Amino acid sequence: DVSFRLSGADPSSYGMFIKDLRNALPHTEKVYNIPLLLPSVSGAGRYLLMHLFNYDGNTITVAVDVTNVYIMGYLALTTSYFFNEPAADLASQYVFRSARRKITLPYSGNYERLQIAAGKPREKIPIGLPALDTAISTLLHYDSTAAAGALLVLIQTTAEAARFKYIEQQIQERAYRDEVPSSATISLENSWSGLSKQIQLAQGNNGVFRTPTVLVDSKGNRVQITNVTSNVVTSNIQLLLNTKNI
Numbered sequence: 001d002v003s004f005r006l007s008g009a010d011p012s013s014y015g016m017f018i019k020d021l022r023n024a025l026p027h028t029e030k031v032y033n034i035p036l037l038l039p040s041v042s043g044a045g046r047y048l049l050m051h052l053f054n055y056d057g058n059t060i061t062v063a064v065d066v067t068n069v070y071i072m073g074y075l076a077l078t079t080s081y082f083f084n085e086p087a088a089d090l091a092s093q094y095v096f097r098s099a100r101r102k103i104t105l106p107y108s109g110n111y112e113r114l115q116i117a118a119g120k121p122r123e124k125i126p127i128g129l130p131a132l133d134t135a136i137s138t139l140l141h142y143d144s145t146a147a148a149g150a151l152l153v154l155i156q157t158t159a160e161a162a163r164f165k166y167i168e169q170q171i172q173e174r175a176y177r178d179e180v181p182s183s184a185t186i187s188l189e190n191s192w193s194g195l196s197k198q199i200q201l202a203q204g205n206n207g208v209f210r211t212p213t214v215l216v217d218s219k220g221n222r223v224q225i226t227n228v229t230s231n232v233v234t235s236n237i238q239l240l241l242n243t244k245n246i
């Protein structure tokens with residue numbers, strides 16, 4: 001399991017959490033020195049538990065699929081909550097079984113559906129450590145519209161930061177003041193599966209992507225990533241989605 005406490009949190013302690021998160025995800029191989037997530041994992045070992053505590057010390061446990069860093073559901077006191085999607089229903093066979101009741105949220109976990117439920121795109125939702133405290137607090141008691149927004153914050157501040165050093169740094173910058181994600185952050189989130197795939201295809205292609213990935217950079221400028229020498233690959237991406245899952 002990994003844990004993070006908002007009470008007393010700072011950029012260093014959040015960095016320790018994101019490092020713990022990455023280090024809890026199993027891998028057998030690195031591809032261009034980046035851990036390659038597993039094609040599949042059977043049974044309960046598929047799911048990592050993240051214990052998150054709000055500033056007041058209240059807690060939720062979040063279940064994360066270790067093959068793809070997708071959040072499946074969460075436990076809040078004696079109630080479990082899972083996305084309305086088959087992977088989460090399967091997760092519910094293994095985690096949080098001792099919950100007194102199980103609620104299926106009225107959306108799947110992909111960004112498009114969550115944004116629909118929340119009423120707003122994530123361009124417009126501030127993220128940060130204070131936003132993560134709020135999210136944890138929201139998820140403690142069911143409210144499906146509020147929860148959609150909370151879940152967009154939680155996904156970005158945990159899973160997306162684990163995937164991309166740039167996103168981790170963005171959240172660190174927002175340790176004490178929330179701000180909407182940069183356009184680069186959104187671009188990276190949206191590109192993770194594409195990037196993961198092209199980095200793996202590059203292994204037999206002399207480091208060259210079969211298909212270039214278009215990203216927005218730190219200045220709002222739109223670049224084409226064509227090979228493994230790009231800083232996105234050498235510095236930024238921290239985890240690859242196995243091409244067996246793409």
Ligand SMILES: *[C@@H]1O[C@H](CO)[C@@H](O)[C@H](O)[C@H]1NC(C)=O
Pocket residue numbers: 208226227229230231
């Ligand atoms: C590969 O990417 C580098 C660094 O981003 C770029 O300067 C270069 O022109 C590209 N080279 C090839 C062979 O695609």
